[PDB]
């Protein structure tokens, strides 16, 4: 399953960010919510103007977020991962997500 890096993300730290992104020539809308007690980011994925999000999950490092969901016509077939740029023991935080902040959220697409 050859895959190539094709997109990177950044977060400003606002607890209720929402924006639209284009992946594999298809367009999706994303929502990020910050959880206080669990100090983690909650990601919701869905179609543009959809009544409810298609997928909701909790973000973690080195875990394949989309693994159990590559069976729907509206879910990207690529790979979405979070891995750190600094010390390997650093876990995902609020302000430490970005191309140079410490954590590299990235999307990669299979070659077809």
């Amino acid at each position: 399953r050859t895959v190539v890096r094709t997109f990177d993300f950044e977060l400003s730290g606002y607890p209720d960010e929402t924006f639209r992104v284009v992946l594999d020539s298809v367009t999706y809308e994303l929502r990020f919510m910050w959880n206080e007690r669990d100090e983690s980011w909650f990601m919701s994925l869905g179609d543009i103007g959809a009544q409810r999000p298609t997928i909701t999950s909790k973000l973690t490092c080195y875990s394949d977020i989309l693994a159990p969901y590559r069976y729907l016509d509206n879910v990207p077939d690529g790979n979405l991962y979070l891995w750190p740029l600094g010390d390997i023991r650093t876990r995902a935080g609020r302000f430490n997500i970005g191309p140079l902040k410490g954590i590299q959220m990235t999307y990669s697409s299979l070659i077809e």
């Binding site: 190539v4 890096r5 997109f7 209720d16 924006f19």
Partner: protein, 248 residues
Amino acid sequence: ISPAQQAQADKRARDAAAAKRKQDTEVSNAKSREDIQYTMFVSGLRRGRLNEFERKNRTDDLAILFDSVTTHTYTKDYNKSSYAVESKASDHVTTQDGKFTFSGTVTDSPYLIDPRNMIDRDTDKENPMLARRPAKAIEILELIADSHQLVTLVTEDNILSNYVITSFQVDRSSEAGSSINVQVTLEEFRFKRTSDPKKAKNANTGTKQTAEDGAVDDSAKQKRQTPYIGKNAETKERWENAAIGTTD
């Protein structure tokens, strides 16, 4: 021409360019910190306004006092439809922004040098004219106007807030030598991250593309990939290339 002039034109360009780096930099940082709050005391002081003048420190709530203020005026405006209304239809009126203007003076021979005034931050006690006070005031005045600070005015009767400076004038006429006459004009401002999640509200950022010069944006601009610092190259290496691949 000769090389001697090329070594002279550079000096003309270098020194002139250095001027923007000084003035242009100061305004940039002055806008990059919103903690500071400027205030102006036009009259008011001795009729019990001292109660709030003493609150002003020397680091956050800077205060400005002029050596003398001659006149200050406050005005508001409204407008209405010039055609007969259909009848009650009392909504045919609008409110404009209130204006405030005053005239003042700064002198080389001050009578009161209270250090709390930000004009007198580091003015000499015994030689006021060598301190060059009028030059101190102008340097302060341009910075406040240029950075677009929301100034607060303390006046005889009322207190006004969220006022921005739109114009001011300075002159040194033959009469009243060793002093400068100053005029200012202000108008209202109907103004309407690290934040508590409980106060957060759903926001939007529109469509977004690849963010910042990353490992993928570098390829788009033909920049060479940033080498990885070898803090550890045994664990991630087997997994990084297999799962994330490389931009190519």
